[PDB]
C-alpha cells in the first residue's frame, strides 16, 4: 500500500511536480504529466477539464480524499493547491496510485 504523503513529498524532492490547476491542465493537454492529483473540492469545471484532457492522453487521475488546504500543506505550501501534476516521480512510488 502506497503512503500518499510520503511518496508525494518524495516525488516533490527527487523528481518534478508542477502545482495548480493551470499547469496541471497544460501538462495534461500536452502529454507531459504521468499522473494528475486533484483535491476533493477542486472547482468542478477544473476537475472536469483535467479529467477530459487526462482521458485524451491516457494519463491517470488520482482523487485525493482531502481538501485543497490539506493538499497544499502536504506540498509544504501556506496556500491551497486544488490540483498538481507529477511530471517525473523521481525515486518515489507515487505513480503506483495509478
Numbering used by the authors: 0 to 97
Task: Reproduce the article's own wording on this structure.
For example, we have shown that the thermophilic ribosomal protein L30e from Thermococcus celer has a ΔCp value of ∼5 kJ mol−1 K−1, which is much smaller than the value of ∼10 kJ mol−1 K−1 obtained for the mesophilic L30e from yeast. To study the contribution of charge-charge interactions to the thermostability and the reduced ΔCp of thermophilic proteins, our group had systematically removed 26 surface charges on T. celer L30e by single charge-to-alanine substitutions. We used the double-mutant cycle to investigate the effect of pair-wise interaction of two salt bridges (E6/R92 and E62/K46) on protein thermostability and ΔCp. Since thermophilic proteins tend to have more salt-bridges than their mesophilic homologs, our observation that salt-bridge reduces ΔCp may provide a general mechanism for enhancing thermostability - thermophilic proteins have more stabilizing salt-bridges that reduce the ΔCp, leading to the up-shifting and broadening of the protein stability curve.
We have selected two salt-bridges (E6/R92 and K46/E62), which are located on opposite sides of T. celer L30e. The crystal structures of the E6A/R92A, K46A/E62A, and E90A/R92A variants were determined at resolution ranging from 1.8 to 2.0 Å. The root-mean-square deviations (r.m.s.d.) between Cα atoms of the wild-type L30e and its variants were <0.5 Å, suggesting there were no major structural change in these variants. The values of ΔΔGint were in the range of 1.9–3.6 kJ mol−1 for the pairs of charged residues (E6/R92 and E62/K46) involved in salt-bridges. The average values of ΔΔGint for the salt-bridges E6/R92 and E62/K46 were 2.3±0.3 and 3.9±0.3, respectively, while the value for the control pair was 0.6±0.3 kJ mol−1. Compared to the wild-type value of 5.3 kJ mol−1 K−1, ΔCp were increased to 5.7–6.8 kJ mol−1 K−1 for substitutions (E6A, E62A, K46A/M, R92A/M) that break a salt-bridge interaction. For substitutions (E6A, K46A, E62A, R92A) that break a salt-bridge, the ΔCp values were increased to 4.6–4.9 kJ mol−1 K−1. In contrast, for the cycles, E6A/R92A(M) and E62A/K46A(M), that involves breakage of a salt-bridge, values of ΔΔCp(int) were from −0.8 to −1.0 kJ mol−1 K−1. For the double-mutant cycles involving the breakage of a salt-bridge, the values of ΔΔCp(int) were −0.8±0.4 and −0.9±0.5 kJ mol−1 K−1 for E6A/R92A and E62A/K46A, respectively. For the double-mutant cycles that break a salt-bridge (i.e. E6/R92 and E62/K46), negative values of ΔΔCp(int) suggest that the pair-wise interaction of the salt-bridges reduces the ΔCp by 0.8 to 1.0 kJ mol−1 K−1.
